[PDB]
């Protein structure tokens, strides 16, 4: 991955995530090699939201 450092502070920062799902669909496989460095972020994100 290319280091998407973004604290999920603003409830309007969902954008970074939209970035992933759209991309995961648009390039299911490339995204698959990087499922692993992406989860760090979802976790950074899931942490605060849930």
């Amino acid at each position: 991955l290319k280091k998407i450092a973004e604290s999920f502070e603003d409830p309007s920062s969902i954008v970074v995530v939209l970035e992933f799902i759209l991309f995961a669909l648009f390039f299911p496989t490339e995204f698959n090699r990087i499922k692993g460095d992406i989860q760090n972020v979802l976790l950074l994100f899931f942490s605060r939201w849930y």
């Binding site: 604290s7 999920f8 502070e9 603003d10 976790l43 942490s47 605060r48």
Partner: protein
């Protein structure tokens, strides 16, 4: 690895408290403009002190 226990603690502290600030505020019927701007502020250091 991942997060802390210290920053993670402050995170639930800001909330329990914030939740508390919420009751007092809805209590003294206040504009949602500031309930939010301020809750937003309270929120910046949850992550900010992370």
């Amino acid at each position: 690895t991942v997060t802390n226990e210290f920053a993670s603690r402050f995170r639930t502290i800001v909330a329990t408290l914030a939740n508390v600030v919420n009751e007092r505020a809805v209590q003294d019927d206040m504009q949602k403009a500031t309930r939010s701007c301020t809750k937003q502020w309270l929120r910046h250091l949850e992550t900010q002190f992370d």
